[PDB]
């Protein structure tokens, strides 16, 4: 059967970037040209591989990570980037094999007066390692005195909501992002091209 990309790409709601979702894709035929030929994606950039070669390759499994960020942050979903998303939310490795796919989701994820459902992590003492995921919510100690779980001065909740309103400039509008990565083990290959 064809790989169920629609479950990922056409999901009703996406994950917040700090709690980004990973879906394993196995035991199916993947026609990657249905994706890269599409006029719907404003970003489709592959690293370590060419998109027109994907259909010729067999993998043990394929993985789809998905989340929502602001338009101006899509450039951080790339090897070697820095910033709040790359540093504290979703980190690709410096040498990456995979594809980054993104599209404007203003019509789905913004709301008159504001959609605040989507969050990102603002405060974190150190950068994420590649493919690390941090969903902790400890009060962030920004001063010399410990917080003991109490918000207050210099003691901050680490997550912050995006403010997605339809009148936002494009760089402040929500973008849905799918990162495809590929896995090759000494195991049967279960996702092949057509």
């Amino acid at each position: 059967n064809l790989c169920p990309f629609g479950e990922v790409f056409n999901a009703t709601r996406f994950a917040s970037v700090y709690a980004w979702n990973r879906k394993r894709i196995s035991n199916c035929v993947a026609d990657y040209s249905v994706l890269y030929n599409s006029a719907s994606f404003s970003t489709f950039k592959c690293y370590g591989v060419s998109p027109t070669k994907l259909n010729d390759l067999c993998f043990t499994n394929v993985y789809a990570d998905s989340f929502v960020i602001r338009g101006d942050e899509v450039r951080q979903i790339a090897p070697g980037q820095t910033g709040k998303i790359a540093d504290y939310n979703y980190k690709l490795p410096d040498d990456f094999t995979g594809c980054v796919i993104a599209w404007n989701s203003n019509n789905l994820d913004s709301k008159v007066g504001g959609n605040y459902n989507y969050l990102y992590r603002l405060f974190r003492k150190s950068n994420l390692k590649p493919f690390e995921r941090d969903i902790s919510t400890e009060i962030y100690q920004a001063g010399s005195t410990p917080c003991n779980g109490v918000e207050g001065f210099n003691c901050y909740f680490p997550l912050q909501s995006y403010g997605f309103q339809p009148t936002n400039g494009v760089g402040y509008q929500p973008y849905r992002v799918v990162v495809l990565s590929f896995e090759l083990l000494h195991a049967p290959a279960t996702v092949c091209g057509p």
């Epitope: 709040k84 504001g114 603002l122 974190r124 920004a142 997605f164 309103q165 936002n168 402040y172």
Partner: single-chain antibody, 225 residues
Framework: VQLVESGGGLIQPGGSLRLSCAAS????????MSWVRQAPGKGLEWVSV???????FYADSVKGRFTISRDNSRNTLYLHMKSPRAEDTAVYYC????????????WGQGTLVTVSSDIQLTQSPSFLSASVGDRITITCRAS??????LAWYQQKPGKAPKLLIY???TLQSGVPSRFSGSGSGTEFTLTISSLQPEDFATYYC???????????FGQGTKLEI
């Protein structure tokens, strides 16, 4: 509780300079820490920021010439000015950024450095003369919708800017209630309901954004008697 700059001075070109900013109670390495500068008679310019995790970002006017760093054991932020030019002459403020990692709630007193020889924000009016008790409005307009990512500052002569309002309408703790902010998207207004004599100052709006860009601050409004 405080940020204290040092290391400024008057230098001839062709050298190097290092500013330092020693913090208390604020922990430098846990915060979005920045340098903001102000040339004599001009507006504010965000120069560089150092993230808690160590990423650094610089305005295009100083990229390649300035470096920001920190010493965790001395709880100190530094600005290393390599090849300083006359156009770097300014008062240099150390700041901590809180809301969205770009709203500056604490400022050092600033240190003077003299060197011998994309969304745009428009603030109106540039000059505003009024009397005590007047109701005054200052408006900030952005070239694209920026939701509520805006803050307002008051700068008295000789002093560091002071945060009044952030998230467009949220009044900073300790600011009198006659100050209020309104608007969203592309138009934001600072209202002072009943002008008092201590309110005569220069006011700045700021598009609250994660990186030091050239249009971070409005050009300012000089409020005069």
């Amino acid at each position: 509780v405080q940020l204290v700059e040092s290391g400024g001075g008057l230098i001839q070109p062709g050298g190097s300079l290092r500013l330092s900013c020693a913090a208390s109670e604020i922990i430098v390495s846990s915060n979005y820490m920045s340098w903001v500068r102000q040339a004599p008679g001009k507006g504010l310019e965000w120069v560089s920021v150092l993230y808690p995790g160590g990423s650094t970002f610089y305005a295009d006017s100083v990229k390649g010439r300035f470096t920001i760093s920190r010493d965790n054991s001395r709880n100190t932020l530094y600005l290393h000015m390599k090849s300083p030019r006359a156009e770097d002459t300014a008062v240099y403020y150390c700041t901590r950024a809180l809301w969205e990692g770009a709203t500056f709630d604490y400022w050092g007193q600033g240190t003077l450095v003299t060197v011998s020889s994309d969304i745009q924000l428009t603030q109106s009016p540039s000059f505003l003369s009024a009397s005590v008790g007047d109701r005054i409005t200052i408006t900030c307009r952005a070239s694209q919708g920026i939701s509520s990512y805006l803050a307002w500052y008051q700068q008295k002569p000789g002093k560091a800017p002071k945060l009044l309002i952030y998230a467009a309408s949220t009044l900073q703790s300790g600011v009198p209630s006659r100050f209020s902010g309104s608007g969203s998207g592309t138009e934001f207004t600072l209202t002072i309901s009943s002008l008092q004599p201590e309110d005569f100052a220069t006011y700045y709006c700021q598009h609250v954004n994660s990186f030091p860009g050239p249009y971070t601050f409005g050009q300012g409004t000089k409020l005069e008697i």
